[PDB]
């Protein structure tokens, strides 16, 4: 068996998606997401100019050898661009292997561990009354878990308040006050629990903005409202930052949508400083690496909570749902819904019912790409915002 061609498809059916297609000599092909929000073309070059020329002629069944060849062989290891390129290759090869086996991908991984996959949606409001209305709408759509974000008085724009953060040709500049946020946000959760009661799962994304003792304070203030998690409370390049938060609160902690390697989270997990790892298939080297992260996590009670924003394409979502159907220590799947225009480019077998997913019984990850339709939507640059404090300091968005 040999790879005879591989190509990168770039399309913008409402936002940019990058997809790798690998084609074998017996006409089976596989696809993988390669989208890196706000840096997309750097991955297109990484694949087209360096990795694809090496793939040609290789036996696609050699998933592990190819993964190690690219992970170690780049010499400069890890990193968002290289690990997203490698994720695209890895997923496309698992898609091929499952097609060759005539099995849905979750069967290759070890079979199903559950009959349905819990998801969460987003409820965002500019103020508290609008936030409560957004929670009602999310519940009305059948979601049993809801991420709640609310505008803060005295702050113009804040994270998560249809929201699509890559909103401009060059980065938008948001302004931020930590103290205004910490004083106000617990009141939002008190009002949501008063209206909606204790059974609904509530999530909150802090979006990198606090220091550890501020996150400790916030976690304590949110304990009465028993959140499913408090996410990304502090930037995590120094993993020891979470030890102080963990010392002071029992609100469960999630982190890691921005990571690309097990080495970004090994210490967070083995020291039991977090409850959910959010690192994704598309941004951290594919299924091969994420199986290892999830298995490592399971020894320490940590559960998977994959990021699921719209900048992860339906190809990532199909791979993630097959992974979610098998992995023992599944926690939750984020679902920020794609638009109809986006979905049409990526026919898929996964489906949603009453707050839960199943991955679909098609062979492979069950996702394809309509190349003729993708070609109708040329790339259009869109970058993520930056965040400044009130004095102008460039802060964490």
Taking the C-alpha atoms of residue 5 and residue 293, their distance in angstroms, rounded to an integer, is: 30
Residue nearest to Cl ion (CB): 79
136 makes contact, choosing from Mg ion, a copy of itself, Cl ion, none, with CB < 5 to 8 Å by partner type, with none
Q: How far is the CB of 236 from Mg ion (least distance, A)?
A: 12
- CA-to-CA dists, residue 59 to 62, 90, 315, angstroms: 6, 13, 23
Q: How far is the CB of 83 from Cl ion (least distance, A)?
A: 7
Contact by Cβ (8 Å): 166, 382: yes
Written as one string, the DSSP assignment of 15-63 is S-EEEEEEEETTS-EEEEE---TT-HHHHHHIIIIIIHHHHTTS-TT-H
Residue 64 interacts with a copy of itself (CB under 8 A)?
yes
Stretch of 76-84, 146-154, 278-286, 302-310 lying at the interface with Cl ion (CB under 5 A): 76-84
Residue 116 interacts with a copy of itself (CB under 8 A)?
yes
Question: If phi over 0 gives left and psi between -120 and 50 gives alpha, with beta otherwise, what is residue 381?
Answer: beta
Query: What 3-state DSSP class applies to 149?
Result: strand
Catalytic status, residue 159:
yes
3-state helix, strand, coil in the chain (%, to 5): 40, 20, 40
Nearer to a copy of itself, 76 or 340 (CB): 76
Q: How far is the CB of 17 from a copy of itself (least distance, A)?
A: 16
Catalytic status, residue 322:
no
Residue 300 interacts with a copy of itself (CB under 8 A)?
yes
Where is the binding site for substrate, in residues? 37, 122, 257, 278, 307, 311, 334
The DSSP 8-state label assigned to residue 338 in this structure reads P
Kindly state the number of chain residues that form the binding site for Cl ion, as judged by CB under 5 A: 3
Q: Of 105, 103, 143, whose CA–CA distance to 123 is shortest?
A: 143
Give the x/- contact pattern for a copy of itself in 175-214, rule: CB under 8 A. Answer: ----xx-xx--------------xx-x---------xxxx
Tokens (6 digits) for 331: 């926690």
328 makes contact, choosing from Mg ion, a copy of itself, Cl ion, none, with CB < 5 to 8 Å by partner type, with a copy of itself
Q: How far is the CB of 53 from Mg ion (least distance, A)?
A: 26
Query: Which residue in the set 27, 162, 170, 340 belongs to the binding site for a copy of itself (CB under 8 A)?
Result: 170
Taking the C-alpha atoms of residue 148 and residue 141, their distance in angstroms, rounded to an integer, is: 15
Residue of 71, 120, 159, 377 marked active site: 159
Q: Which residues are catalytic?
A: 159, 207
């Amino acid at each position: 068996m040999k790879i005879v061609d591989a190509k990168v498809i770039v399309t913008c059916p409402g936002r940019n998606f990058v997809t790798l297609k690998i084609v074998t000599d017996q006409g089976i092909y596989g696809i993988g997401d390669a989208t890196l929000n706000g840096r997309e073309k750097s991955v297109v070059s990484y694949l087209e100019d360096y990795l694809i020329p090496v793939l040609i002629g290789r036996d696609p069944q050699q998933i592990e050898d190819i993964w190690q060849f690219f992970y170690r062989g780049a010499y400069w290891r890890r990193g968002p661009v290289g690990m997203t390129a490698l994720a695209a290759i890895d997923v496309a090869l698992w898609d091929i292997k499952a097609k060759l086996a005539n099995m849905p991908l979750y069967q290759l991984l070890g079979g199903k561990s559950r009959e349905r996959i819990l998801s969460y949606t987003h409820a965002n409001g500019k103020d508290l009354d609008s936030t409560l209305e957004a929670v009602r709408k999310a519940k009305d759509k059948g979601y049993k878990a809801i991420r709640v974000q609310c505008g803060i008085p005295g702050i113009a724009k804040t994270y998560g308040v249809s929201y699509e953060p890559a909103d401009a040709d060059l980065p938008s500049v948001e302004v931020w006050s930590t103290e205004k946020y910490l004083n106000y946000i617990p009141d939002v959760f008190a009002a949501v629990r008063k209206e909606f009661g204790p059974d609904i799962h509530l999530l909150h994304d802090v979006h990198h903005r606090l220091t550890p003792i501020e996150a400790a304070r916030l976690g304590k203030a949110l304990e009465p409202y028993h959140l499913f998690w408090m996410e990304d409370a502090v930037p995590a390049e120094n993993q020891e930052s979470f030890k102080l938060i963990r010392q002071h609160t029992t609100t469960p902690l999630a982190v890691g949508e921005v990571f690309n390697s097990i080495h970004d989270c090994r210490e967070l997990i083995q020291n039991q400083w977090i409850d959910y790892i959010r690192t994704t298939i598309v941004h951290a080297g594919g299924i091969s690496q994420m199986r290892r992260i999830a298995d490592f996590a399971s020894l320490f009670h940590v559960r998977t909570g994959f990021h699921g924003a719209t900048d992860l394409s339906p190809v990532c979502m199909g791979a993630a749902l097959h992974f979610d159907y098998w992995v023992p220590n599944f926690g939750i799947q984020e679902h920020m819904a794609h638009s109809e225009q986006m979905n049409a480019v990526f026919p898929h077998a996964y489906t949603f019912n009453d707050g839960y997913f199943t991955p679909g019984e098609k062979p492979g990850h069950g996702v394809d790409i309509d190349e003729k339709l993708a070609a109708q939507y040329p790339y259009k640059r869109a970058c993520l915002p930056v965040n400044r404090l009130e004095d102008g300091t460039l802060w964490h968005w």
